[PDB]
Each structure stands twice: as C-alpha cells, then as structure tokens.
DNA sequence: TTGACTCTCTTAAGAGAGTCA
DNA sequence: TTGACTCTCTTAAGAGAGTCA
C-alpha cells in the first residue's frame, strides 16, 4: 500500500509464505561446459497456492493482501520490488526469472529491468560461457546455440550486395 | 497450384523490384571492438513503395501477385524462401532480419528460421565477438550489452538460498 | 490486375482487473 | 477477509486476409 512501512510489512509476508513453498533443486549448465545447481521455491501445481496467491493464467499468479480495509494486489514475481522504480529509460520495469523456471518465486532468482533485457537472458552464454549482463545470469540461457536455421541468405540474380 | 517455375518467376520479379529500393550504407558493430559495413535496400516510409507491394502495418508489408486470374499475396519478406520448407522442429519458420533494419527486403540480409531463432539475433555478440549461429549474423545484436537491470536478486529476511 | 488502404492474429517473455463463494 | 476462478492486455520480433475502384 502507500506507507513504506506497509510495503514493507507486504514483501515480508510475501517472503514468508515463498519461504514455505517446495524447494526443488535443478542442476543448469553454467556455459563453458560446466553445471551448477538451483534452488527453486515452486508454487504449487493447483489450489491451494498458498497465503495471498492466486492463479490468473497458466503460468500467472497474483498476491493479494487487505490494507486500511482495501484490496492491494500484484503480479506474483513484482513484489520483492515494490520499492523499486517501476520503470527505466521509459520502459516498464518486469520480473525476470535468473533461473528461467516461471513457478520459481524465490527472489535470490529474481532481476527487475526492461521487458528486452528479460527475454535476452534466453539466448545468454551464461556465468561461465560469457555473459555480460551487469546483472549476472545464474544459468547458460536454454535457447543459446546455434539454432536451426532452415535456409540462409541468398539471391537468384545479381541485384545484391552484403 | 502455382509450379515451381511459376515460384521462381516470382522470387524474380520481388528481386527485380526490390533491387531498385534505395541502397543506404550503414556502418555497425561486428563484435570485439570492429566494425563493417552493410547495404540496406529499403522500402519507401509511404506509398507508392514499388510493384506489387502495400503496407499493412507501420512496419508490415505485403507482396501481391495475380497469376492465371487469381491472386497469391505473400508477407514481403518471406518470397526469398518460397521454395524452402515452411517449418522446422514443429515451429513455423519466419523471415529474420540479419541487418536488424525492418524496411529492408535485401534478401542478402534475410534468413528463414523459427521465431525463438529470429529473436534470439537481437543480443547475439555478432560474427567478430563469438556469434555461434550456424547461419552467422553480420553483426552485433542491437541489444547485445550489459543491460540496464535496476535491482538484482535480494531477499529482506533469511529464508531463500539460490 | 493493381494500388492503397482496412482489419485481426502469433509467440513467449511479461501484465491488470472482475466474478463469485 | 481470503480463496479460486474468469477475462483481456503489453511488447517487439513476426503473420493472413478483406474492401474498393
Ligand atoms: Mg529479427
Ligand atoms: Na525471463
Ligand atoms: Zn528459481
Ligand atoms: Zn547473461
Ligand atoms: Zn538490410
Ligand atoms: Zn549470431
């Protein structure tokens, strides 16, 4: 809500209700032919989710907490960054999952920046294969490698230059 | 069904039209500190934009063809690939802009692969700063950087580990 | 047959808000 | 107050199809 205290007293009780969800551990290449390990705390597949949370998409949760006798309610993954500017560069700011798992919600996997910084993190080389993200990635992206292109560039005549 | 000769008569008559588009040099980063060269063939910012062609979004356009009394229209991008399968890997293939430049129809700047493969290329290191593409870029994603994150993971209490 | 407009849709990273019990 | 559902929207890389003269 508006007070600092309140939002405050809003990320706390959020953490504490993550704090209990299953931890789950995934093992991520890193880059450069290395593998570190995760620890994801996953919402629950279906109801019950836990103190606050409801499902609004297949993959989309809400918190919800009752202020001064008002509903307050945020993206699931926006609330370890209530005090943060919600937008840079004129471009709003997202939740952006470090460990590329959306049930995650565990904050030490959480990153707040621009919608285009957020998808790169899929192509990202990883912590040990490169990145350059100021904001370290925690894992090799799952879309990085070569890709599979069907066909390259190409001409018929002799119109073109590179 | 139009033959295959019928195809190549039109991948002729798009590259004869589009070879005629303005050709603006711009210079960009290739990737470890170097820079080269590229020849953008644009299409025009209004109409008309050449034969056969018409805009259906602010950056979308079509190209239109009427061949033994019906006409065939195409995304103005795709007609270099006609001839190539449509899919790859279950995912429909797309026209991805190598030059990162939207109005160009250059089909030396073009490729054909999935959507997720296209993306990717915005924040690739480029052909000198160790793009892995087998289909290479030629150059430097545009977004390719250390991003501009404004808070990293954090957790106010004790009860994450990553 | 052609030009110049019109409209909505796809994807996968993300959002906000209303209806009931 | 809290839970469990419903719906549509944003972005920036991409699409198909209709109307009129
Ligand atoms: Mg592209
Ligand atoms: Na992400
Ligand atoms: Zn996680
Ligand atoms: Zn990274
Ligand atoms: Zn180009
Ligand atoms: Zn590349």
Not at 16 to 28: A, D, K, L, N, R
Not at 29 to 42: A, I, V
Request: charged residues 10%.
């Amino acid at each position: 809500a508006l007070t600092n205290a309140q939002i405050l007293a809003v990320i706390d009780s959020w953490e504490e209700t993550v704090g209990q969800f299953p931890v789950i551990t995934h093992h991520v290449p890193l880059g450069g032919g290395l593998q570190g390990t995760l620890h994801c705390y996953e919402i629950p597949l279906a109801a019950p989710y836990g103190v606050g949370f409801a499902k609004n998409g297949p993959t989309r949760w809400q918190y919800k907490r009752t202020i001064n006798q008002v509903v307050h309610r945020w993206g699931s993954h926006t609330v370890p960054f209530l005090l943060e500017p919600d937008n840079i560069n004129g471009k709003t700011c997202t939740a952006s999952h470090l460990c590329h798992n959306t049930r995650c919600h565990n904050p030490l996997h959480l990153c707040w920046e621009s919608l285009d910084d957020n998808k790169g993190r899929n192509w990202c080389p990883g912590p040990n294969g490169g990145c350059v993200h100021a904001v370290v990635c925690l894992r090799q992206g799952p879309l990085y490698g070569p890709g599979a292109t069907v066909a390259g560039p190409q001409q018929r005549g002799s119109h073109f230059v590179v």
